[PDB]
Each structure stands twice: as structure tokens, then as C-alpha cells.
Amino acid sequence: SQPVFASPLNVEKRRLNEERALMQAQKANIQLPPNYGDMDLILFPEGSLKNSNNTVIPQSHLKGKSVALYFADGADPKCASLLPFLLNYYRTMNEGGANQKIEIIFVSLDRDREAFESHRAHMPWLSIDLENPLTEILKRHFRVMKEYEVPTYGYGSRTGVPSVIVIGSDGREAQFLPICSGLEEGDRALLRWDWRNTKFA
Amino acid sequence: MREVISIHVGQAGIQIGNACWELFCLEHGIQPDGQMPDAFNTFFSETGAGKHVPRCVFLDLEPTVVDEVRTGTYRHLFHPEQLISGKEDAANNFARGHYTIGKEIVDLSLDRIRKLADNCTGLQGFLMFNAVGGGTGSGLGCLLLERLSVDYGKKSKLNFCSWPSPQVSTAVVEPYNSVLSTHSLLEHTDVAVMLDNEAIYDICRRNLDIERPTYTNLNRLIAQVISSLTASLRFDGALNVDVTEFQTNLVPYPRIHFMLSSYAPIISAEKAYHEQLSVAEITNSAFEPASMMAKCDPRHGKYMACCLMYRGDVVPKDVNAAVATIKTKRTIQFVDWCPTGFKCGINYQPPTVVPGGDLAKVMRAVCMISNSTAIAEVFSRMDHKFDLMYAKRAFVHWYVGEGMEEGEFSEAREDLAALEKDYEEVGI
Amino acid sequence: MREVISIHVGQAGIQIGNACWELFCLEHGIQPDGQMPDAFNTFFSETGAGKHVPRCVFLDLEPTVVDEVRTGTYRHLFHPEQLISGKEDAANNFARGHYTIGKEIVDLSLDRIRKLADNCTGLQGFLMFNAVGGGTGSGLGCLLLERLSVDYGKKSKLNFCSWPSPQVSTAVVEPYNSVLSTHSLLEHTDVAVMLDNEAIYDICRRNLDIERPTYTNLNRLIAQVISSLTASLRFDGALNVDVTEFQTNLVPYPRIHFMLSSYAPIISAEKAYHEQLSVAEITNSAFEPASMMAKCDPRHGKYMACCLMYRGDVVPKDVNAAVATIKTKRTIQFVDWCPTGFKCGINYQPPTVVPGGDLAKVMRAVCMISNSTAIAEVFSRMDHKFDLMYAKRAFVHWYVGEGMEEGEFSEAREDLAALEKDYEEVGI
Amino acid sequence: MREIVHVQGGQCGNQIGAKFWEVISDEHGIDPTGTYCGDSDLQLERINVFYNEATGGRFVPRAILMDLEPGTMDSVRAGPFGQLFRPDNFVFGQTGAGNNWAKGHYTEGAELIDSVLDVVRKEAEGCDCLQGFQITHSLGGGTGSGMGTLLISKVREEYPDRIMETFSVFPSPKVSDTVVEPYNATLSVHQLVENADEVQVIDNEALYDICFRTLKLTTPTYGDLNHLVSAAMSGVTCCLRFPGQLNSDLRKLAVNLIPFPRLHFFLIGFAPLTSRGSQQYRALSVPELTQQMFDAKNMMCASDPRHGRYLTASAMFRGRMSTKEVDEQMLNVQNKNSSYFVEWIPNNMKSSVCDIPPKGLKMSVTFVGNSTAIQEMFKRVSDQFTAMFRRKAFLHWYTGEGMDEMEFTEAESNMNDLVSEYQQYQ
Amino acid sequence: LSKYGLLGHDDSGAESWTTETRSEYEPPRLRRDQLKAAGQWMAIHVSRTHREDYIRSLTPRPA
């Protein structure tokens, strides 16, 4: 359910969870469907995360970190004005600390594979390739939209391109980072990122 | 048992109300549906299978926000006719909201007030929130205080109104709206608390330091403040100072109950890691002469009384040292007939912060609801704005065509001038 | 109880303090984020989970320096409210930071110093870092010390100020910023330590023997001086000295408060092997005229008082032999009225080294803060350059349009000439 | 933050400003369609100093282009980086100033006043605080000299507590286009001494000659002529957008240069300007730049400072470079050029370590200097005035649009009173 | 020839652009690391030598 009801992650959420709850039904005072606390997910499969040199990184690395989706497009000039600023904020968290603290995952709005690589080589943090359908189902979950083409389900777009958002363990958002929002604090709202209340646990 | 009734008049009071009831439901563990997976009894009734309804009334003469709540997230936390709305916006007219369009839902609003009050005995008071500077917030608020002083004369009436600021007042006819509600809250309201939109603008731009937050963030800071007021009702603590004590100790005169508000520490996201939450510095910042919520400078006024509601893991010793050092500072002064004017109501529960909002998880907090003779300047600039506008009959024909007679314009002016002479004479 | 704050005003103050707070953070085992993976109380403040906030202010009118530490690797060690920015550079003008818009900076800087001082069991230091000839170094440096003089009365004002060189000035109005700063630095600060740039480029020439040091290698040496000066407050030692008695140790007269600085041993790691640095030879290497850091020859300046700070595994008895052979040595002039003029403090910890710096690790070090009459000859040459600026009134009427009255150059001149004449009558 | 407002004035100003907006854009790493490319904090964190947002991330310069003829502005949309400017920022003249100061300032330029104020105030008050202005214009023609000096005569008294830097292209002793030379030159300069904060003198005739020995190419087009100017255009304001060990800004640069309010005419030059044959063969260091910028032959102005004497010098070095190698190397040039510097000011120079190198080059320096050597260039303009004014030549075109013989004689009297302090400060 | 034009005497680009404060005042345990790969690191003698006293000088603090 969090933060958005209708999303491809959250229709897979309900299909997965009360399926194994009805596995527990005829296996045995269970209640159907389960409570939102009882639903649990895996956000990224085994073959999703790619680092800089295109090797797989599992989900176990993300523990004890502050992981945030980075919804961005290479040709967007507002992404161009943000990308160095978030590069600086990455290296200040990482180097200023015994264990590197924040972690940024990439999803892209680019045109094709070649445009994806030119935006990828400038980025040291982890990334998700465009051919994975995990990217497109994440567009409809956190409601990031460039220009309204795909049908939204009675919603209005929360963000614009680009938008960074910190997440939790079960697909929820933790706190918003308004670089283009109702606050529209461009290139300054990255300081609002916390790391005491949002830990991917 | 032990419960209070909250009233919201005008869409400013509604936008306060959906913020306070946003915070009240989360700190009690209940949901927008009304279920939780007996401290909640002061704000929510019990109905069978754990569903809770707030003890509130929503009043607004236009549907532009009331049915929008009826389509919003909090549809079914509220009772259906808990949200009362007419058709026609009163539109910045005290006379319209007092005579013609107000009375069609005055009888509807008293019917819901009776039905929620007689639910359980042991009611303490009414917590009314409205806009003084508008039409229906001032006019329909005046009739509700007129008709509640004749039915529940004994019960408390704590008001929290959005008084304007000298710089920005966002209106052209609000000198007429404010001084015409001045006649209503002297002899009817028990204790009136002055709030101000642009003072909370001042707080959120330099202390929590977002460049552009809006109405929806002032609503969070009001919700924090009224939470710290009502905390002693809800949760246990070292000392219990509830809403029946707030008037025993802050107001010494029947005509002197206009008094300010303050909240410390209003901490941003980045400020919480470094700034240690010493009880000594949160009281100092609460007493800071520009950290309150009125644009009301107290350096050229005297302090009558002060209550400090501490909320969190607070020991009373460093509270006693915090109130020791605030007397020893020569910067502020208290009035000469009152050497001791402090209250320390402590509650063990830490403040409940909203994730994804703008504040951070603070271990301790302090709420400063203080009476002072500094009401004189916030009402004398208000008197001067009335003087330059009333002298040439501007916006006068709108009110006299709605039933209100010319002459009540005059007697509200010397009613405010009499209160000005009261605050001047008492500070001697 | 032990507590010293730092006030860095000017681009020199931020750059020197950039080296100071990186040296202090590596010495207490503090990462750049602030948290350690009871001696930290004197320079930092405990908060949260061991995360330390330095008792400091980084003040600068112009950007591009103060945002550089707002964007470097030390952003999240500093509280972001003592990081102070304006928009306009003080522009190498004394009267821009003293007689036009810098009031918006000083009115909240005193607020931040008050907030830092309400964190303290006992205050004993006012370490101010600035450049004399810079516009905001002299301009706001004058205004902050007069505000702190009337705010905080009888405490110790430390000041490590960068005097301009005899030979280079990197400006043409360096006399115009030096005589004005000094005219109000005599009556405001308590301990003024002279620093001067190519005394110390020449130090890095013949001692550290590296072919390109810069302004940042200057600041690492100065940070080593401050660290050894205040090491006695941090760790226990054989003979503990205190910053509040340097005030009574050095100055003989109320107007004679200018001292010197010299650091030893300063040998890079390649030549730190041919000789074993003993206590009796680091004293001679510090007392030599080519090791002090203001390039004034003490051959023609009579020594008055002298204080030596020791850092490492040093016993006091070879200190006693070392100070005896200095006292009997004739090439160091001591004046006839003062036979006892040495104060030696000894601390236990070895001096720390930046990882891979031009300084080498050493088991012992000496810092010397010495009062001498030779300051009269540094000041008499800046005295001569001020008349030769003022001969046909060059660069004076933009000061007049800035806000100073034409004619306060005259009493700033007479204060500097009273400084010229009084060391002459002392030395007899 | 600190906003600089740029104006292109006249045909020379429009063309020299087009190349400067090309060299700033790729110094910040910006595609001429508006999108930023280059991936660095240190060239993007200070971009609002010259540029503005466009709610798409696009950056548009804070530059207005103003000209009384439509010819050479159509060339800058046609040329590269023509889409970078704002279309509203152009203001048009459909008549064409025919080399006359009278229609530049009084008559034909009066109807363009109500449009040029409405676009320069719109750009100014949109920011929180303006820092200064920076115009580029030539004293030769009419729409640069007369129509440009009309801007200084109005922007100062409406924004009094600010500054501006005017880069004036000055005429030639030897070559002569724009045959009515001394009338436009004198009519601009007497306004310019009273009412402008500093003036940088830029000389075409001399900058052909830097292009003939140190850059020594046979076919000098107006492109690389303006590219050599745009290096010192960029270096004089580099620390406004870039950090440094010892900083400098325009307001500071005025405070420690101008001693008396009536001398503010400054030489300008850029080092290194290394020949194409000498490119690989210079292990470039601080000693060889110092002799290059204290070299008379390498000055953009057509004045030899051997005859003159530097009242105050200034150098904004750029790049990763040592700081005392600035300091005692300039003490060496005082001790060797003792007679080339004024004796009643010791330490006559600026040092300023702009910590960011020029575009592609490891390290450089930009020299600006208040010199008394300009008195010979100001007196040949004076006798060029008098030689053509005794014969009353080329005056009927001026007087027909509201001139006076009286107003021409305080133009020469302010010219002589401008030269007057220079030879008695020697 | 170049890739940057006439003013570029050679090619460095903005990829080689940092400041002295950013390059040098970076985290110190990091600054230990790349220097570790590139070269990180009256006379009184020991009690063995028979210079000055050596009998009772050997007993309380042997060396």
C-alpha cells in the first residue's frame, strides 16, 4: 500500500503475500488478507544491481545503509544541473566516515542503451539497467513522470524529472527530497537527507 | 470521563483542524480508518469494534474545503455530519456571518455540540480555532461563543485565533472583521491565545530554515503546539497541569486574557544531529523575544505569567535551573506585583514527530503559553488601521446592507480602546 | 571546566582554522563526520552518540571561502549555524566591514557566541584568527572585539593576527588596514601574537627544504603552534600551565601586549635521522633568530618575558640545564630589570603529525611565546609607510564616502605613534 | 548571489561579446543548446553569477544586446551559440546609426531608452542582490560610442551604490576606419571619466601587433582578435565564480587600484600568448609569465609603458601554482624595474590566486594596470580633435541633431583636464 | 593540434580541476593510503657505551 496504492510492485505485493497466507490456511485463527505490517517484499532480485564495472551486487550489501532511488534522464538539463551536486554529496558521506553511509541506486528515463551508457560512466554509485522491467514498474510506483503518456490511476504526478527519494525496506518512501516539488528547493534539498531514521533494515 | 471538544470555524480553522487531528491520531496509534492494531479517551470515542471518532465539529459556510475533506484521506475517521457545511461563503463580511447566512447552521452546530457533550460527563473545555481576519471565521465564531456562553456558561473556552501581522495581512477589509470580533472574545472567551501566520512564517524560514514552506507547514507547528498543551491531559508525567489550571495561573483579571504562545526547539532535519537538547537552552530559545508566534516584541512589555509544558524525558532539576537563570537575566522583566510567574508541567512522553514532514525526532520539548502586557502594541497598530479606514465610510455599506446597524461599528472601537486602557493601566 | 572557543574572521581565519580543526580532529581520534569510532571538552562538545561539535565560528562576509568548507570534507563536523556568509566581499577595505553593511553579520554572530557560551562550565579562551590587512579581518575584526569587550568583561582575549610583511604586502592599502586595526586592537584584545608570511616561507625554505609550499602549508605550521600552546588544557603533564595565566605571565603593562611565536624542531623525515633531537638543542634551535616567525631580529630587540611549552617525553631537569645555558648565552639580549623571565610548561603526549605531511614525527617539541621590544621596529616601518601613503591623501576619500570621518586617521596615527614611543621608554 | 549584468553595445560590442559568451560557456562546460555537460561541481556550483535558470535546467546568460542597426545582430543568431541568449534580451534598431554621436545619444537613441531600461531593470531586480555590470562597446562608431555612453549616463543614478566595468575599444593612430574618429572618441570619454567606475582600454591596432609577433599569424580575422580579448575578459572576473587561496572581486579591484576619482583608465593583457611553434617547448612556470606580463610589447593597449610609469599593477594568476612564487618574484621585479614604478607607493601590485586554471591550460595570469603611459594616447586624440576642429570639419551632421560648439569645448576641456593629472603624477 | 583551441597550449580539461583545499584537505586516513603506496614514512648515548656514567646509570632504567 505504501506510499501509493496502485503500482506494479504493490499488485505483486498482494498477489505474493496472501498467496502464502492461504498456503498457511489449509496447512493449519489466521485472518485473510494480512495486515500491511505482515506483507513483506524483496525490492531487487538477484540479477538487478550493477555497480560501476558491471558486476552483480546482492541485496545483503544494502544493510545498514541509507538507500535512495535516483530517477533521472541524461538529456534533461535539470538533471545536468543536479548531477555534480549529488556527486559531491555522495563522496562527503562516503569518505567522511569509517563505513560509507548513503547509497544511490539509478533508474533511467533515457532513449536507448547508448544514451544510458554516456550517463552511466559519470556515476560511481550502483545502477539498474534500462532493459530490466524493474525500472518501468518503479516509475509507476513512486510516481515520477516526464510528460503524461502512460495512464495514471486517478493520481497527479508527485515529482518531475529529476527526483531523488529515500526508501525503506518494503517499498515505502521514508522522507521526500524536494528538488522539483511543492517546495522546489533545487540543488539545495539534498542537505535534507537524513540517516538516523531511514536505514534499510 | 476526561475529554475535550474542539471547534473549527472557517477554512483556516479547518486547515488547523485536519493538522491537529493528523497528529492526534498518530500519537494515539490509531489510523485514518479508526482502528488501532485508555489515554486516547480525551480525543477519541470508543464505538464497538475499536473504531474511533474525534470529538470535534467542523464548521465552514462554504463547501470548498469541507467536502474536499469528505473526498480526502480522512473520510471515515470523522462522523458524516460531524462535518457541517452550508452553501454560501460569508465572504469577508462580519454582518453576513452574524445575521443572515450564519443562523441557518447555528442551530445545526449547537445540535452536534449538545450530542457530543452529553456523551460523557466530566467535560473540561472547548478548544476553538478560527480566523479573526475573515468572514465566517469571525461572524459564525461570534454566534457560537454567544450561544455557548448561555448554555455552557461554566465550562472553559480556550481560543486559538489567527490574528494578522503588521506587515502582511492579505486582506483589505480585515480591520472591520477583527475589531468586530473583538467585541465577541472579551466577554465570552475565557482565555484567548494570539497566533499569527507571518510570525510562524518567520520561524520556519530561519529556525527550521526552509526557504519556501506554506500553510501546510504552519499547520504542523500549530499541531505540535496544541499537542504540547494537551499532553498533560493525555499522558502521565512528573507534574500534571491540565486545561482547568491554565486559566488559574496565567490570567489575573476578567478582562485580561489575551496572551501569546511559543514553541522550542523547532528543529530542522540537519539541526537535530549536532545541537544537544539541553533543558537550559530550550527554555532560553522559548524565551527568545523573536521566537514566539505573534510578531509581538516583549522587550518593551512586562510579563504577567508563564506556563512551560515540558514533553519528553525531562528531569525537574534542570528545569528549576532553567527557570532560575531566566529570572537572573536582565534582558526580560516581569511585572512588579508578581515575582513568581512560572509553571513546569512535565510529561514523560517524548514528542511525536511526523516522518516525511519537516521536524525531527526531538527527545524533549517545551511549550510557552505566556501572558504579557505586550498585547498593547499588537492592538494599537490594529486600532490605527481602523482609524484611517473608518474615517471615510469605506467598506461600510457592505455591512449595513446585511442587517448590522451603524453604531456597532463605533462601540467596538471604544471597546478595543477600553481594552487598550486596561493593558496600559495594569502595567504600572 | 576547560573550554576555549575560536573565532575565525576573514579568509585567513577560515584558511588557518581549516588546518587547525583538521589537526585537532586527528589528535582526539575524531573522524571528519565528528563521531569517535574527557579531554575533548576543551575544543569540542559532546552530543548524541559521541559526535563532537567544535566550539567555533567560521565568519566571512564573502562567499567562495566559507562555502568551500561548507562543501569540502568537513561540512558535517561543523554546526551549520556558525558557518556565516554574506554576499558582498569586504573588498580589502577597513570601513566596509565597520561602517557599512556588516551589521547583519555581527548582530547574529554575537547571538552565536552567546549560544556557544551557554554550553560551558567555565570559559578561559577567546582565540581569534584573522588577517590584519584584509578588509573583513580588520573591519569586522574591530567590531567583534569591541562588542565582546562590552559583552564579556574581564576574560582573556587571545588573537593570532597576520601582520603584513615588511617586503611584500599583496595590497597597496595594507598600511590603511594596519594602523586602523591596531588603533582599536590595543584597547580590546589581551594577547596579540604577531604572525608574518615570509618569515615562515623562509622557515619552510631552510628547514623543511620543500620546493613548493603554499598558503596551506603555512597554516599547518600555525596549527602546530596553536595545538602546542593549548595542549596543557587537553592532556595532563608534569607542569601544567593554563591559558588564563598566560595573561598574567607575559604582559608587564596594560598597553604592552604584543608577543611572538616560534616552533621547533621543524625537520622533514629525510634529515630527521642524522641527529637525535635532544631537549638542550631544540631550545637553541628555537631561540636562534632564523627560527622565529615574524622576521624581526632579536639581536637588536631586548627580551622581556618568555614562555616555553613542551610536548613529549621530556624530563624537567634537562629543561633546567637548557634554560640555564640560554640565560648565560650573550647573543640573546636580556634587559637589566628582569632577571627571572622564563615560564616552562611540560606536557606528556608527543606532538601529532598529519598523515604524510612535510613535518616529521618527533618525540619532543617547543613552542615559544615571547614579549620583546623588537616589535617597535616592525611597527616603525609600517609607521613610515603610513605617512608615505598619507603624503598626498591617496585612497582616503573612498574611506570618507564609506563612513569614516576624514580626520580619524589622525588619532589612529597618534595611537600608533604612542605605540612607537612607549617601547622606547620601556627599553631604557 | 552576486549577479553581473552584461551589455553588448555597438557592432564591435556585439561581436566581442559573442566570443566571450562562447568562451565562458565551454569553460563551465555547456552545450550551446543550453544543456550542461562536463560533470564537475567546481564549474557548476557558481553558475548563477553570469547565468539564470529557465525551469528546465537551461541556463540563459544575463546579457542584453542593444544596437541601432539590425545587421550585426542578425549575424549572431546566425553564428554559433546564437540560441544561448534570451530572445527578449535583444532590442532592435531599424534605422542604423550612421557614425554620428548625436543620433547615438540625443535624438535617435532617445526612443530606444524606454525599452532598454525595461529589460535591464527586469534582469536586475529579479535577483536578490546585484554586484556589478560589465559592458563591451567601441568608441569608434555611433551606435557603440554614443548609444553606449547613453547607458552609463542613466544606469548609475538609478543604481548608485553599485559598480561596473566598461571595456572600451579605442581607435588607432596609424590605421583609420570610421573616418569621423576624434568626435566620437572625445564625446564618449568625457562622460566616461565622470560617471564610470573603471575603464579597460582595448586597442585593435596593438592587438593586431600581439597577433603579429607573439601570436604571429598572417591572416588575422575578427574571430581570434576577439578571442584574445575574451581571455582577459574572463580572467579579470574569474574569482567571482571560482574559489581561490587569495580572492579578488571587481569591487575590491577598484578599491586598491584607483587612488583619486578621476583616473580609472587601465591597461589589460593576458599571459601566456605562446606562439604555435612554441607550444610544446615551454615548460610553463611562474618566472616566465611574470616577465611576459611585465613586458611592454605584450600589452593590448597601443601605449608603451617604457615612457610611462605604473601607478598600480594587478595580476590574477590562475591554476595550481605556488603562492610565494607570486610574492618574492614580484619583489624581484620591483627591485629591477625601480624606475618603472611609482616611488611614493611601495608594493604596487595585486596578488590573487584564482585557484581555477583557464580552459585547457595548466596555469596563466591576467594583468590589469593603472598606468600613466596612457597620457600619450590621450594627447594624440586631443590633437586629433583640435586639428579637425579648427577647420570646423565634419560638424554639420552633428549640429543638425542638437549639438553645440559650446558642448564640444568642455569635451576637450575635460579631455585636457583628464590628461592633466597624468604627467604631474610622474 | 589540440582538442580545445587556440588558447589551449595543451590539453588538461575540467576533469583535472579541483582546488588546493579539496585535493589536500581530504579525509586523513584516506591521505594515509595513497601516500602509503608512494613512500609514506652534549650527546647522550645508551647505557652500553662507557661515556659519562655507566655503573649506576644502568640499574634503575636499563637500556
Ligand SMILES: Nc1nc2c(ncn2[C@@H]2O[C@H](COP(=O)(O)OP(=O)(O)OP(=O)(O)O)[C@@H](O)[C@H]2O)c(=O)[nH]1
Ligand atoms: N493558521 C492559518 N491561517 C490561515 C490559513 N489560511 C488562511 N488563514 C488566515 O485566514 C485569514 C482570513 O480568513 P480566511 O481563512 O481567508 O477565510 P474565513 O475566515 O473562513 O472567511 P471567508 O473568506 O469568508 O471564508 C487570512 O488572513 C489568513 O491569515 C491557514 O491555512 N492556517
Ligand SMILES: Nc1nc2c(ncn2[C@@H]2O[C@H](COP(=O)(O)OP(=O)(O)OP(=O)(O)O)[C@@H](O)[C@H]2O)c(=O)[nH]1
Ligand atoms: N598566514 C596566512 N595569511 C593569509 C592567509 N590568507 C590570507 N592571508 C593574508 O591576508 C591578507 C589579505 O586578507 P585576506 O585574508 O586574504 O582577505 P579577507 O580577510 O577575507 O579580507 P578581504 O580583503 O576583504 O577579502 C593577505 O595579505 C595575506 O597575507 C592564510 O591562509 N594564511
Ligand SMILES: Nc1nc2c(ncn2[C@@H]2O[C@H](COP(=O)(O)OP(=O)(O)O)[C@@H](O)[C@H]2O)c(=O)[nH]1
Ligand atoms: N575587436 C573588434 N573590433 C572591431 C570589430 N569590428 C569592427 N571593429 C573596430 O571598430 C571600429 C568601427 O566601429 P563600430 O563598432 O563597427 O561602429 P558602430 O557600429 O557604429 O558602433 C573599426 O575601426 C574597427 O577597427 C570586431 O569584430 N572586433
Ligand SMILES: [Mg+2]
Ligand atoms: Mg462570517
Ligand SMILES: [Mg+2]
Ligand atoms: Mg574577504
